[PDB]
Structures are given as structure tokens and as C-alpha cells.
Amino acid sequence: NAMTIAVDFDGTIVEHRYPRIGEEIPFAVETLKLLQQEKHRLILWSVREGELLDEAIEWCRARGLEFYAANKDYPEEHQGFSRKLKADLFIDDRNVGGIPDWGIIYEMIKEKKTFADIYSQ
């Protein structure tokens, strides 16, 4: 119901300009904040590590987007470990079939809908 959502950074929240940071994908940050308002947890899930991760985090922080955690299952993660996050949902531009715009991402999460639902009329 409330969910832990893994969100990719490059190509997902911003245009893919790695090692640099691209322009924001329209409504990315706002949509994610709306999801937090709805009590979902956001975890940043990026191949970024070290200062390139830090750069992604500060870029988000400056837009008032702060993560439950970054590349961890919880902010002080060994113990009950797995390398892959235990997230309930993955938002990633490299997901097979590609990611739709943030409008549709939001409707899908909110209304519990598949691409199939979205498109079927």
C-alpha cells in the first residue's frame, strides 16, 4: 500500500549526461515528492558511488528531494544483506519497455495500473 520505491538517477530523474548531470526530466522531482507525500519511501538506486553519488544527492536536496536512503535498503546498512535492493518497485529508464513520463508513472502507482491497463480503452 505504502511502498519502497527504488528510483534510478541518470535517464530517469535527469537527462543522461553522466558523469555530468542533465536537465530534469519534466515533473520528475515534483512527482517523486508527491509520492513521498503519499507515504512511499524513495531510495536512490544508481551505479553512482562516491562523489558522483554525492553530486546526485545534493542536486536532489537542492530541489527539496531527500531520499529514505541511497543505494542501501535503509540509511545505515553485513546483516540481512542482499546486493539487490529489497524495494517493492523499480523506476528505471533501462527497464525493459522503457519508462513513460512521470504523469503515467504516477497514475500507475496511484491507481495500481500496468502499462496494459493504461493503454487498454
CB of 16 to Mg ion, least distance (A): 6
Closer residue to a copy of itself, CB minimum distance, 74 or 119: 119
Residue 11 binding a copy of itself, by CB under 8 A = no
Q: Which of 5, 6, 7, 10 binds Mg ion (CB under 5 A)?
A: 10
Q: How many CB atoms lie within 10 A of CB 111?
A: 9
State the number of CA atoms in the 13 A half-sphere of 101 facing the CB: 6
CB of 56 closer than 8 Å to CB of 21: yes
Using CB atoms, what's the residue nearest to Mg ion? 11
b/e per residue 4-24 (b: at least 16 CB within 10 A): bbbbbbbbbbbeeebeebeee
Residue 58 is inside which H or E element, if any? helix 50-61
Residue 100 binding Mg ion, by CB under 5 A = no
Residue 34 binding a copy of itself, by CB under 8 A = no
Window 40 to 79, contacts with a copy of itself (CB under 8 A):
45-49, 71
What single DSSP character describes residue 97?
T
Q: Is 92 annotated as a binding residue?
A: no
Binding region for a copy of itself (CB under 8 A): 5, 45-49, 71, 81-92, 94-100, 104-105, 108-109, 113-116, 118-119
